[PDB]
């Protein structure tokens, strides 16, 4: 989670970075109870069910927009950031988290590499990117390499002075997206053991013997897990 939820962020909304998270246990309780983030908006996911739900793929997108346009990274939102830069139709029941980057933006005035796609011919497709420096032209005269009164530039930087801001000041938005393909889902999440104290119902891993437990001495192979002495009745477990 830290690889994305916590790193120096030079990512810009114009070229957002995506990460494939899989083959790992996923504890979301740490993110939910962190209270180190300004927002944790979640749509079609329940906070209790987030750990319970298992997912084939986990995709995390990291980008930096001003405080005012954090709202635009949401389903059914219209604005320069959502249409031209980063778009979420439903977010696939994903969760959007914002952390203030004003502390990250050190110095009296650093624009870094943050840029906004003000000029784009059309609206992007869900989870799509755009990195064309192609001059907008915005006129009958075709703009090539030479600059023109109408050539302009598609990307414009954002000034992040520490003083004031708040709206101009950016909360880095990291979007989570969990999809469910045919491939098996391993993305999800014990008590003390009393032996012979009393008859106790139980579930070790998938079985429910509901019988008193005692110390055994039977020889047992390594790769094996449990034993069925007769009539497919489970007598011993490891």
């Amino acid at each position, epitope marked *: 989670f830290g690889e994305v939820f916590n790193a120096t962020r030079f990512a810009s909304v114009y070229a957002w970075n995506r990460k494939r998270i899989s083959n790992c246990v996923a504890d979301y309780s740490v993110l939910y109870n962190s209270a180190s983030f300004s927002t944790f908006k979640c749509y079609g996911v329940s906070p209790t069910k987030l750990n319970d739900l298992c997912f084939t793929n986990v995709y995390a997108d990291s980008f930096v927009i*001003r405080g*005012d346009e954090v709202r635009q990274i949401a389903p059914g939102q*219209t*604005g*320069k950031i959502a*249409d*031209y830069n980063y778009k979420l139709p439903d977010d696939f029941t994903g969760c959007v988290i914002a952390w203030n980057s004003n502390n990250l933006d050190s110095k009296v005035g650093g624009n870094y590499n943050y840029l906004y796609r*003000l*000029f*784009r*011919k*059309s*609206n992007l497709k869900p989870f799509e990117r755009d990195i064309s420096t192609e001059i*907008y*032209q*915005a*006129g*009958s*005269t075709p703009c090539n390499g030479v600059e023109g009164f*109408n050539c*302009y530039f598609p990307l*414009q930087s954002y000034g992040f002075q520490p003083t*004031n*801001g*708040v*709206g*101009y000041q950016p909360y880095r938005v990291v979007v989570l997206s969990f999809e469910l393909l045919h491939a098996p889902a391993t993305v999800c999440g014990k008590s003390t053991n009393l032996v012979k104290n009393k008859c106790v119902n139980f579930n070790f891993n998938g079985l429910t013997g509901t019988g008193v437990l005692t110390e055994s001495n039977k020889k047992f192979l390594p790769f094996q897990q449990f034993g069925r002495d007769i009539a497919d009745t489970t007598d011993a477990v490891r």
Partner: antibody
Amino acid sequence: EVQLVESGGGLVQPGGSLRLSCEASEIIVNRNYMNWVRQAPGKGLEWVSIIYPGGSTFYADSVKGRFTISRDNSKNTMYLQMNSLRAEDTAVYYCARSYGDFYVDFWGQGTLVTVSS
Amino acid sequence: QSVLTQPPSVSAAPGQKVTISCSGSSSNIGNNYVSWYQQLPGTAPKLLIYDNNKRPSGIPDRFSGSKSGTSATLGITGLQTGDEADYYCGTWDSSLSAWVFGGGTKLTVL
């Protein structure tokens, strides 16, 4: 040379439907962010609607619902249609080109829309 | 709709610098760029200030502007007969998503 030509403002009664058109040279209407702004006689400018290049439409709560807008790529024209005409509507409407939200440039002479008995 | 406050009139003799100040809030002026537009009587307004301090191409000199946080001021060394006109200040209001323009200041070259 960029030019702006507009017509369609006329005497009308309240609740009426009226349309405006704006014509431009050297600038493509769809590619360029376009705006519609109005001035009541001897009164401060009031912004009405902006159309983003992809197709986003934003309006003002004062003119919300009563006003409507579209841009036609084939005719290279921007259209402002206004229903539910009100006492306030009387003004000269100037179509304008904006560098995103940074600033408005190339204002047009506009046409006087008059609503009265 | 929040409206920026503008001085109702500013009058000076020729050869005197003139300052016009646009009142503002973080929701509008504090977080977004401000521009000044000059409308002669009977003409559509022409952009006077390109972006905060910046000046657009095609604009006479002696015209300069300063964004002092919430409020932005416009400075004009000398008041020539042409300078007399109406000036307006505009910025995007993030919360209501509307350009906000002040009523205007009627400059009178005396």
